[PDB]
Amino acid sequence: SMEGILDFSNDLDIALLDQVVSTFYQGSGVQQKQAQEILTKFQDNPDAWQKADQILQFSTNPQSKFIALSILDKLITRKWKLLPNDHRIGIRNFVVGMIISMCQDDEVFKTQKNLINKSDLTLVQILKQEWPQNWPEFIPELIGSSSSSVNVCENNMIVLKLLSEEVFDFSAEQMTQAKALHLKNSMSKEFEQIFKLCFQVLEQGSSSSLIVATLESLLRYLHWIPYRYIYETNILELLSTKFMTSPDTRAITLKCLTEVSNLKIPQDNDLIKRQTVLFFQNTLQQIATSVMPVTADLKATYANANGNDQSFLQDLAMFLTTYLARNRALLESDESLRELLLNAHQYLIQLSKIEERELFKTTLDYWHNLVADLFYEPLKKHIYEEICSQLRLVIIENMVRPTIQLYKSEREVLVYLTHLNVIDTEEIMISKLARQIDGSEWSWHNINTLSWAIGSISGTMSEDTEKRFVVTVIKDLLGLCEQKRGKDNKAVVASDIMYVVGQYPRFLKAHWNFLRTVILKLFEFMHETHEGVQDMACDTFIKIVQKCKYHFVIQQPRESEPFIQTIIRDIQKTTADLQPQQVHTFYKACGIIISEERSVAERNRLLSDLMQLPNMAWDTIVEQSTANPTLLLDSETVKIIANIIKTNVAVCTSMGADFYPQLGHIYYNMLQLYRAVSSMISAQVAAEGLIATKTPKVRGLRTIKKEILKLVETYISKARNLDDVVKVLVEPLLNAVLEDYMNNVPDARDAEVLNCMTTVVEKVGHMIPQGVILILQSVFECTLDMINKDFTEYPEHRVEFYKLLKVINEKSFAAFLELPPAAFKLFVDAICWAFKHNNRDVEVNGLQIALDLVKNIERMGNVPFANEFHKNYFFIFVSETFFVLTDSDHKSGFSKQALLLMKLISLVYDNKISVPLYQEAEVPQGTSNQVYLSQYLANMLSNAFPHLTSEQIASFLSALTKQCKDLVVFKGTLRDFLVQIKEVGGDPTDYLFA
Amino acid sequence: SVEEVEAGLKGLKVD
Amino acid sequence: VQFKLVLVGDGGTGKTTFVKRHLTGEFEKKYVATLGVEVHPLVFHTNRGPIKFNVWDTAGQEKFGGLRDGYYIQAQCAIIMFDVTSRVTYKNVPNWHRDLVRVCENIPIVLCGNKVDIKDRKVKAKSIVFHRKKNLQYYDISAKSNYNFEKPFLWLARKLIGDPNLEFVAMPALAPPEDPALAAQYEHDLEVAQTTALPDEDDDL
Amino acid sequence: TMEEDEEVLYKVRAKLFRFDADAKEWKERGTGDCKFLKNKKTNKVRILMRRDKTLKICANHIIAPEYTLKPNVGSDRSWVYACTADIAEGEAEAFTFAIRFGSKENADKFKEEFEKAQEINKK
Ligand SMILES: Nc1nc2c(ncn2[C@@H]2O[C@H](COP(=O)(O)OP(=O)(O)NP(=O)(O)O)[C@@H](O)[C@H]2O)c(=O)[nH]1
Ligand SMILES: [Mg+2]
Secondary structure, three states: OHHHHHOOOOOOOHHHHHHHHHHHHOOOHHHHHHHHHHHHHHHOOOOHHHHHHHHHHHOOOHHHHHHHHHHHHHHHHHOOOOOOHHHHHHHHHHHHHHHHHHHHOHHHHHHOHHHHHHHHHHHHHHHHHHOOOOOOOHHHHHHHHHOOOHHHHHHHHHHHHHHHHHHHHOOOOOOOHHHHHHHHHHHHHOHHHHHHHHHHHHHHOOOHHHHHHHHHHHHHHOOOOOOHHHHOOOHHHHHHHHHHHOHHHHHHHHHHHHHHOOOOOOOOOHHHHHHHHHHHHHHHHHHHHHOOOOOOOHHHHHHHOOOOHHHHHHHHHHHHHHHHHHHHHHHOOOHHHHHHHHHHHHHHHHHOOOOOHHHHHHHHHHHHHHHHHHHHOOOOHHHHHHHHHHHHHHHHHOOOOOOHHHHHHHHHHHHHHHHHOHHHHHHHHHHHHHHHHOOOOOOHHHHHHHHHHHHHOOOOOOHHHHHHHHHHHHHHHHHHHHHOOOHHHHHHHHHHHHHHHHOOHHHHHHOHHHHHHHHHHHHHHOOOOOOOHHHHHHHHHHHHHHHHHHHHHOOOOOOOOOHHHHHHHOHHHHHOOOOHHHHHHHHHHHHHHHHOOOOHHHHHHHHHHHOHHHHHHHHHHHHHHHOOHHHHHOHHHHHHHHHHHHHHHHHHHHHHHHHHHHHHHHHHHHHHHHHHHHHHHHHHHHHHOHHHHHOHHHHHHHHHHHHHHHHHHHHHOOOOOHHHHHHHHHHHHHHHHHHHHHOOOHHHOOHHHHHHHHHHHHHHHHHOHHHHHHHHHHHHHHHHHHHOOOOOOOHHHHHHHHHHHHHHHHHOOHHHHOOOHHHHHHHHHHHHHHHOOOOHHHHHHHHHHHHHHHHHHHOOOOOHHHHHHHHHHHHHHHHHHHHHHHOOOOHHHHHHHHHHHHHHHHHHHOOOOOOOOOOOOOOOOOOOHHHHHHHHHHHHHHHHOOOOOHHHHHHHHHHHHHOOOOHHHHHHHHHHHHHHOOOOOOOHHHHHOO | OHHHHHHHHHOOOOO | OEEEEEEEEOOOOOHHHHHHHHHHOOOOOOOOOOOOEEEEEEEEEEEOEEEEEEEEEEOOOHHHOOOHHHHHOOOOEEEEEEEOOOHHHHHOHHHHHHHHHOOOOOOOEEEEEEOOOOOOOOOOHHHOOHHHHHOOEEEEOOOOOOOOOOHHHHHHHHHHHOOOOOOEOOOOOOOOOOOHHHHHHHHHHHHHHHOOOOOOOOOOO | OOOOOEEEEEEEEEEEEEEEHHHOEEEEEEEEEEEEEEEOOOOOEEEEEEOOOOOOEEEEEEOOOOOOOEEEOOEEEEEEEEEEEEOOOOOOEEEEEEEEOOOHHHHHHHHHHHHHHHHHHHO
């Protein structure tokens, strides 16, 4: 029944339209959903704009009108010029005449702000098409009508606000460069009259709604107008005094003054300097007298959230931080400006105590700007000693757990602040620590906050002041732990103590006996069943080791052995109560220490002893697994095997090239284990179906394979002896992994195989051309068939596939020359397939592969393979690239699509393609590829975008080819074309813009 | 007072 | 006590997935583009009473935009969504905001950076500053991991009720209640459910 | 909250799934604490589970003695069982549930407590 409005054979039933609108907005459920689908179909009808005349004239529903202005809006923006000009006259005059009819009706001008705003914006769309060339009296008539009515004068401010936005703020993406500059020039040359109307309304009052709408438009003007309209009039005095008084105008006026603190102003005139000081003095005066004094508790005010207090305090922080970062040097020399400068910063201090993360980040950014300047600029830090002293407390008390971005910002400000006054910082911190022990501020959150603060300033004090500070801090922290009862308390204190010491390696390195006692405690802590202690002890251990490794590898005075030997000897007892993942962290730490030993025989012996336990379990299993593979069905055995390999990955991660001896001990049996595991995965999917890949049993077997590939990848990525890589490792690896991947069903293939092969080609690809050929043959076609039916399935194989092709195309392009012509054709298809992905990991590599392939072909010179490549694939690459550039579904790849396109076009205009790109029949003989390239492109665009004129297509290509050595201009010309294909009747002269 | 904190670390406990 | 909330942002940023998570607790893995818009009532239980959001989940892909800024009329609050793994979706946030505050000139708005669970984050935290001059509240969120997934509605509820101390509280849990003609019917569904593998078996929970 | 007249016998962190039979698919229902609540005045034990943060109920039913815990094909830390009257979101509807825990141990101990609670509901 509701679908009657969709029939344009009959005449519109306005009453039937008002109901389906009301059923959509005020309704619910199925009838709302159905009214939605008909209102979309109605507005989407290409003839609906015709019936917009009578909807907006006879309907009583404001939503129905609004919708019809949308229908109009789509017509004005996209098909305006295609209309017979009589319709352009009618829509124009209807839209204007309505706007005044709504303005004069005080009833409607107050109850239908949404509709009047939509009508103003629709008018602005017409002005983008018609003004000023076919409407040069708009601005003079706008100023004339303003004196007639306060309501039309206010609405004119709205029209001017919207006009300035469409022209200057949101034009770069929505119109051509030429059309934007035309509108910017037009507004620029008639602004003198607009400003006087704006300044008169502000100066003469008195309607607050009219003053606010004029201040809102002024906010938009300040983005672009020249300095003189602000500093050569009285307007700074009005903004900084009169309008800071009323709260109706205070919010907009603050935003205006914030923009003014960013205007382009000559830094040598001292009058403008006094005008910049004066509006700041006035603004701060109005705040202190009409809003709140500098002592006010902005923390509590913000938390109460009365009215617009939150928005106001946000705007105050934006105003102060913006102005002071640019102009505070204007206040630092004159003694009469010193109170104004410190009051401004004292307001920031109070703003900085508000519990509001995003606001705090805004103030923190300014504090960073300030303390950085006091750290470098002479004679400045004494001005702010009391501001800085308060800031230290604010930052120490709001320290966050090391968002990590916020923490790093807090650490940087606090390190600066500590260098500016080391003595103040220490006194605050010890003071806060005392009140942690006397119980006045004792809290789990408050002791953590303080430890982070103390830990964050490491490396900023003198080594001997640091030594006494660290000693004092550890001492009080331990007396805090003893005083506390219960586990959950004594666990958090003891954790912070370990976090602090982990932050002070310069202290640990100078006092071995202390460092030794630390590590011994972490070892005791690796048996504490209380949750978090074990994870804490392991993280601190590897953290300290990274910094102090040299002190574990040497033999310290009055010890018989390097402490590493002591750690390794008791490793089984030390880690006996840790989870596997924590055991691997422990071994990784030991690997860090061992790699610091540069005597090869000592290093290898340390490596042999560290790996004793996993090597013994390995040897046992490989003997029991081979005789005979029923053991690998046991869940416990695959877990033990997985953890042995993970242990090897962990030690290999920290030891890199030095891990080679331990790899050689297990390598041949590990690849054998890889083959055996592979058979059982295959046997299981055959016996149970594809669902077997989801079972714990097979997920555990695939874990073994993945960890084996991760170990080999980890080593090869860090190996320094590549001769051993190729001659010892690569051949058994490929035999073990390539055929198994190729001959498995898709669901049983491990994408890690591709990732491992990418690393092999990356490191030693130049040394194994027959190996790279064997990798392609075994993974190229069978992986492509997995991923070329949609953009969804096998997401990991998709990403690794194109990383593999990318490095092969970089390192051993010879492999693609050996592909049979049918397989090379799939390679080109695979590249373009990557273009069409929305997934960024695939799209970026696909564009990069295409670019690198073109350069690979160009480097071959005038040879048959390069000539045949262009004959077969040049226009495929040109048109596939044009397709993703123009379909609006791959905007994230614009820059690299443009780069590729220009490379393809420049090839022809530099005559690097030796053969003709056409068939001998279709074009006369001797015609340049350049002439044929323009013909192919003109024909291609004409059929793809039939609504473009031949002159548009011809002016676009003329500009594009001429600009194929200038990426920034080329891109601007592509952007202009992307705009023109969205409408009808685009001006072809636009492409002469550059 | 380094040997002092040191001895205190040693006694660090949770029980 | 119900409020209309419009949800705007680029296609594929996860607007629909975020609402589905709040409606059923499901995580929809597939991207089925929203067409025009989908209205969903969402109720939360607070210490000040139940709060009802009529969530207007609009479409982000221009081809399916429908009525576009017509969906915003009379909105009382809004969420602007982008994806921190796609810089273009953050670049378009000023466009969605402009279209929004032209209709709803004075409403609380939350800017949400979705998909912080992905490791290769492209829109870094220090680069997200658009909300500052526009007085929007900002949250890193992830509909997949539920990181901060309740914050946008908690903040909006506090602003719409005018109580900075409003809190989500546990709904009352009524006692739950205690045939052979369906014994073979439930067993049929039970064995196909057993043989369908649970998703995300590598997750922590 | 209507929970003080009960005592908590078991509490475990879990993820709850409901089976969409018409759509080949398991769908998450909630992640949070699963509790076995014994009513002080009827000695009846039920399942109460709420979603983290919003605290919305995603499981509310009695541990019927007729229910049976079955493993699922791709997990050693989950159970699948048919439920005939769950009131988490209104009327008592029938569901095929799956519940997953952090480890095989918490899954096994859940089964322990699940069947013990069935014996208390038997009397
Ligand atoms: N990894 C991850 N994926 C997410 C997250 N949120 C949504 N997605 C995924 O992103 C894709 C888009 O989902 P969708 O909710 O439809 O986004 P949308 O903004 O509603 N699209 P449209 O504007 O066209 O209606 C889905 O595949 C979804 O699984 C997230 O938090 N993390
Ligand atoms: Mg959607």
